[PDB]
């Protein structure tokens, strides 16, 4: 078998969800160790299945040397859902538009059927939606407020009662949105809000982080602190989780934000 000659004609940009990272990943990161002697530890963040940067060992995935290996992404299973740092603003635009109890849109879709698609959701979220009652579940829409102490925390203000929208709660809210609402709000079927919350992140290929850089320290910290969160953790809107777990969730989400959007 031979690979024929080809050229790239077009490039498509999309949002990568859990499924993309799970099917495009060549291994799953499970331990915080780094080496077993001189070879990379199997299951760590330097696993040779992700690529190779040393003459001592070749790539396990493509059997190439470090010169001909372009690296391969890995998977890290987050014990708690994490928001996408690049699209946090987009998350806001979705929290103010759809109901937080049944997923039905709180704004009238027909009011925006004449605008162009790129600004449909922006103009829908620009309107005042706090206090609007859903026409299906009869639930008053709270006020979605961005916490000023960080870049990724959201709160729901229901007539003075304040709740914290943890990423699991946000994911449950977003998974209740139908594709009809996504299409009618100018977005595509590849930009469903359920992809904005990640429970499985992508460890970049070693070719992106050679020197088995300082970005590898961030990944190692993020891997070690992920194991501190209980796997069976469950968050439900209104629950008062302990400060021990709440503190750990903040660092894990902040670590991932700094892994992608530090000093940007």
């Amino acid at each position: 078998m031979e690979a024929g000659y080809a050229e790239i004609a077009a490039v498509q940009f999309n949002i990568a969800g859990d499924n993309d990272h799970k099917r495009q990943g060549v291994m799953e990161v499970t331990i915080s160790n780094l080496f077993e002697g001189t070879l990379p530890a199997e299951g760590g963040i330097y696993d040779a299945r992700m690529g190779t940067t040393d003459h001592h060992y070749k790539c396990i995935t493509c059997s190439h040397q470090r010169k001909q290996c372009m690296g391969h992404p890995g998977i890290l299973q987050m014990h708690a859902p994490v928001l996408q740092p690049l699209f946090i603003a987009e998350i806001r635009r979705w929290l103010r538009v759809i109901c937080l109890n049944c997923g039905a849109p709180i704004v009238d879709l027909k009011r925006y059927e004449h605008l162009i698609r790129p600004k449909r959701l922006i103009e829908a979220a620009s309107s005042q939606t706090e206090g609007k009652q859903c026409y299906v579940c009869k639930a008053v829409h709270p006020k979605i407020v961005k916490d000023s102490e960080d870049y990724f925390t959201f709160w729901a203000d229901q007539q003075g009662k304040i709740d914290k929208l943890y990423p699991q709660i946000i994911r449950e809210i977003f998974s209740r949105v139908t594709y009809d609402t996504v299409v009618k709000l100018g977005r595509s079927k590849n930009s469903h809000p359920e992809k904005l919350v990640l429970k499985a992140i992508q460890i970049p290929p070693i070719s992106i982080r050679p020197g088995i850089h300082d970005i590898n320290n961030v990944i190692q910290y993020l891997v070690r602190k992920n194991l501190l969160i209980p796997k069976d953790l469950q968050i439900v809107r209104g629950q008062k989780i302990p400060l021990n777990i709440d503190r750990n969730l903040q660092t894990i989400q902040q670590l991932y934000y700094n892994f992608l959007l530090d000093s940007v």
């Binding site: 078998m1 024929g4 000659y5 080809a6």
Partner: protein, 336 residues
């Protein structure tokens, strides 16, 4: 099942000047070198039949090597294996605690993994040829491999069946499509007729769901084999003759169709009734005439091929005496 297919590919040419001399011959040779005998695009390429159309030999633009490339669309004879397919010859390669490995000795290269949990397995010693049946799963055609990945067990004949309730008539175009399967069955029958009748009778008696009482051969002038049990007072109908008459619009395909185990699965007989008189243990499947006919024709094809390849593989009594351990195991699992 050996069939035709059409593929698209792009081939790199290191010496365009030499290639352009005899383009069709060089293209056929390179295609045969690259794709013959390997899995590609969910199929295993057996032969390259020809090239339907190609593109001009362009010159690579992203490098200064001066090489060329050509897009070729070619028709190839390939093979695709399905679930419940009957393979009459696999060679037991590895027999360990975890799994069992076999390789087909027929014209369909496939490696078969076998779970040791099933009692019909773990008996096939290394070096024995055991006819197996692929399990209810897809066959994996990994690109670049010379074999196919499949799972299955030694073919123990089943005791149940399915009843098809047909509420749709057979259209002329569907009958014309099914005449190809009819021709395949006809060619299989004429190939079988050249084989030893004693081996045919032995293997049909061996793989009967029931047990043949005594030597009594049933004949239809197109299929010859041993005769087994009946179904009360119900009479079977020839499927090939029914299809031929349906081509002339002379029969009705409505009603309940069944192939209970009392019929020889390698015979073209089937049961058609106006009422669900079959003592089946499941809800009859509502389907059109074409669906039922496709299923029955492919089952007949499968069993005819199974018997033919079984007779081809075991050509002498020495192999039968060597495999008597498997034969007795097959014989034991039979309903009284």
């Amino acid at each position: 099942m050996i069939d035709q297919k059409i593929f698209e590919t792009t081939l790199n040419i290191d010496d365009p000047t030499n290639f352009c001399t005899n383009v069709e011959a060089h293209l056929l040779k390179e295609l045969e070198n690259i794709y013959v005998g390997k899995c590609f695009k969910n199929s295993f390429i057996l032969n390259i039949t020809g090239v339907i159309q190609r593109s001009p030999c362009f010159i690579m633009r992203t490098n200064n090597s001066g090489r060329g490339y050509m897009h070729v669309r070619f028709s190839a004879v390939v093979s695709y294996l399905n679930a419940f397919d009957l393979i009459a010859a696999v060679k037991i390669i590895k027999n360990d605690s975890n799994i069992i490995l076999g390789e087909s000795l027929l014209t369909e290269p496939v490696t078969i993994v076998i779970p040791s949990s099933e009692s019909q397995n773990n008996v096939a010693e290394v070096g024995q040829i055991v006819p197996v049946q692929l399990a209810n799963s897809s066959v994996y055609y990994i690109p670049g491999r010379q074999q196919a990945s499949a799972t299955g067990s030694i073919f123990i004949p089943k005791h149940t069946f399915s009843v098809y309730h047909v509420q749709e008539e057979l259209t002329q175009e569907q009958a014309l499509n099914l005449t190809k399967l009819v021709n395949i069955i006809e060619m299989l029958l004429e190939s079988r007729s050249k084989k030893d009748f004693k081996q045919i009778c032995f293997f049909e008696k061996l793989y009967y769901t029931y047990s043949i009482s005594s030597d009594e051969i049933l004949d239809l002038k197109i299929w010859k084999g041993p005769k087994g049990k009946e179904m009360s007072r119900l009479k079977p109908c020839n499927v090939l003759s029914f299809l031929y008459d349906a081509l002339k619009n002379k029969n009705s395909s409505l009603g309940f169709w069944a192939r209970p185990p009392n019929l020889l699965k390698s015979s073209p007989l089937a049961y058609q009734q106006d009422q669900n008189s079959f003592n089946a243990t499941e809800l009859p499947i509502i389907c059109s005439a074409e669906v039922m006919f496709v299923t029955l024709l492919k089952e007949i094809i499968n069993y005819l091929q199974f018997i033919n390849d079984l007779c081809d593989t075991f050509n002498n009594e020495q192999l039968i005496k060597r495999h008597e351990n498997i034969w007795m195991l097959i014989e034991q699992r039979k309903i009284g």
